[model samples]
Target chain A: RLPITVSKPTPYTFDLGHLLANDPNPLELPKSEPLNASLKATARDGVQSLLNQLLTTCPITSSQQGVLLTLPAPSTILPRHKPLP
Target chain B: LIEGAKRVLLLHGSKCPTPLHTVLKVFHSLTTPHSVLFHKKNENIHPFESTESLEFLANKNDCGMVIFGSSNKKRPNCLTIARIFDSKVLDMAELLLLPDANGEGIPEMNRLSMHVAIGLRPLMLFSGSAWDDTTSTTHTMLKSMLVDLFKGETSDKIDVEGLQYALMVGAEEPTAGLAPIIHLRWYKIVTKRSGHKLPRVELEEIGPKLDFKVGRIQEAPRDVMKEAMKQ
Candidate 1:
């Protein structure tokens, strides 16, 4: 198909007044960055530090894709009480 | 949502309609050598009503866009177009109206369908065929216009969240110019997630809903889109 006349990165104006009840709530999108996949010395250091922090609270596992962690649950303490008589 | 890969989430309502099926068929026809999965669930339970399922599935499946379909007596052909941002359904579009020339609410064709095909490969195809001969010609025209609108690494290329573009497919003056035009709305996701991780997305509808008309098609659809999206 033939390309349109508009240039790349065309900016359009969005009005807040036209917001609808079902419209998605506005949020700032995150910036795009490449993933650091190579396993180098610095990479190992970064990963080790991140893992150390996470391991402090949760159990973690190594999977084919990457590291997986089980989220830590809050501790609940119940007071000891005598049975109702 | 997957850190390294990009995919599209294709879904239809629990009670699938004829047009919804047609769009799905076209989606499958356009993609191949693909790892597409089908999950049928309850419509009353909106699939991505919250953060959990939306985040989990987008991450698990490496999806970038989620195109949902549904139908009702009031508006038989419905689509919910959403962008997957950091494992959340960000800006979404539903209720596509084919307004009159003056941009006022007006009656239009009875049956129409649209299906989105997206992936990281940059080979995106937005094609569809109508049911009746009356609607087929215009439908093809609409499809071509969409292909042109999202040409060469636009929507296919990954952006901060995703490349943002919305096209409102207007009806074809089938009997008249046989021409089909679309209302284009562009947006940028300006806000960030709220405390609850819900899409507090401020979508500034840039550009006037410009009407873009492509030349007409006279031929009707010979084959109904019965094929599914599969490899």
Candidate 2:
């Protein structure tokens, strides 16, 4: 079969795919920066496929972007004493 | 009684009303920082007669009687004073001291000696325990005169002993709190020669025509007080 490529969208952002995609050949990428070795490793193909699937199905809309039901600051109601002559 | 002098100088003062008029009506005299006399009635400060002239008026007018009110928030509460000697009701205290300037025994001289009350708004009388020591000594001396003038005994009906006797049992105890000690000879001796009269008479009285009046502390334009608060 001839070479085929799929361009996919992302739910959060596409950068997450590159972060999670494992590269067994470390020389392929820049080694100048330290990596988070503690992260669990997954097959590079699996992570790419999952990311692409999620991106195609979900997207953020302007209506779902912010917090709901803001509240006012609390206050104290104190009375004053009437002074003597 | 002097020419152009006011015969009856009325003195008044009132304590701020609290829940209980009883606590406000204690017999002994004391001054607390927050304890201020209530004076919301009048605001004008009129010129009063000169201090030097009060004695002349008192003597000339035969002004033997003075009225005292329950409230003493102001130095010279004229209303109460007027009430004391409103010409209808007779005051025994005035009857005893006003006429007999030369009476040997009574301490009339000390009573009329100089006094000065202090503070702002309606001025307060310097009375009771906190009274200037100088005024206190003079007050004592006058009490002695009262004791001597009426002699050792007096009642409502006149006897060999004069009104002074009635005053000791009546006016002295109730008004000035000097009855118990006034009768004792030794106490009188100690007070007789005490050189403690106030050097200067700076007492402030309430009303338009007293010797002194306190000017407004922060006299803004007429409407400034009404418009002080913001919308």
Candidate 3:
């Protein structure tokens, strides 16, 4: 069913409060819980996988948790953000 | 596409030293039919003559990913290539760049790091800090940036968030406790009132590995990679 489009999303005094119960301000809400978890896991998985993959491309020592290798040459900086737990 | 590639000539920047072994590695990754003719830097050649030769050599081949290796720790040879070919949209086949703290080179993650895919628009940044370490301040800033990407402040750049399912090429094991660490972090930022997903990212983990080319750039057979054998 197509719902009426409203410019202002009122969290109070709504005729269909039940329908809008799960709705929150776009700016205020965090990302979907499931997706957030999955994305984090994906990053971890990717790094883990890359570590294993590197065994052949370069010399590396593999362990249960991750691979161990010497420090790589330092380059540029990554001025980005990580999620809060 | 074959013809375009047939005219392909691999040119190495004069300042950069790309060993023949490294060039072969890229070709091995392609899997499909491809060919590359190798050449070495002639120390006796004049600089201008070399430049003219490069231009001519570039036109000879359609488009091929030129391989670069860094023997000098202080100098980034591949970066010179990036600057020289800045005018040309060369097809960079892989992402691994820079040496790890142990002086080993690896690809930095783009998601937490923005700079890696800055010019390579349409390729959303992944593992921005994959090669380096992370800090708290940069982490917050990256989160805000990711929010902008999702909110349409800037159009979706590459949608790396979408490539979660694509087959990954390579990865990096963070340098063991080094002087510089590029932190990799992800954040969930949603619009407060709309419940819309405002997913964002941040990190200090992305490092020079993504910026400069390093190592021998060895090519390994997929079977070899699958076997996970140490080179």
**Every candidate's lDDT:** 0.33, 0.20, 0.27
User: What TM-score does model 3 achieve against the real structure?
Assistant: 0.28
- TM-scores for the candidates: 0.32, 0.17, 0.28
The CA lDDT at B32 in model 3 is 21
lDDT of 1: 0.33
* DockQ per candidate: 0.02, 0.00, 0.03
Q: Residues A1-85, candidate 3, lDDT per residue (tens digit)?
A: 2211222242211101000011111222124543223334444333323322222233345556555433232122111111112
Q: What is residue B123's positional error in candidate 3, in angstroms?
A: 12
Instruction: Give the i-RMS of model 1 in Å.
Output: 24.0
DockQ of 1: 0.02
Candidate 1 residue B34 Cα shift, in angstroms, is: 5.2
Q: Mind giving the per-residue lDDT tens digits that candidate 3 earns over B5-101?
A: 1222333434444432343333222212333344456532222213344443443543223332323444333321211122232212222234434
Position A18, candidate 1: lDDT = 13
TM-score of chain B of 1: 0.40
lDDT of 1 at B79: 50
Give the top-scoring candidate (TM-score).
1
Model 3 DockQ reads: 0.03
Per-residue lDDT over B70-184 for candidate 2, one digit per residue giving the tens place of the 0 to 100 score:
2222432211221111222221221111111133222212121122111111101111121113344333323322222212111112211110100111111223442211111
Q: Which fraction of the native contacts appears in each prediction?
A: 0.00, 0.00, 0.00
lDDT of 2 at B29: 11
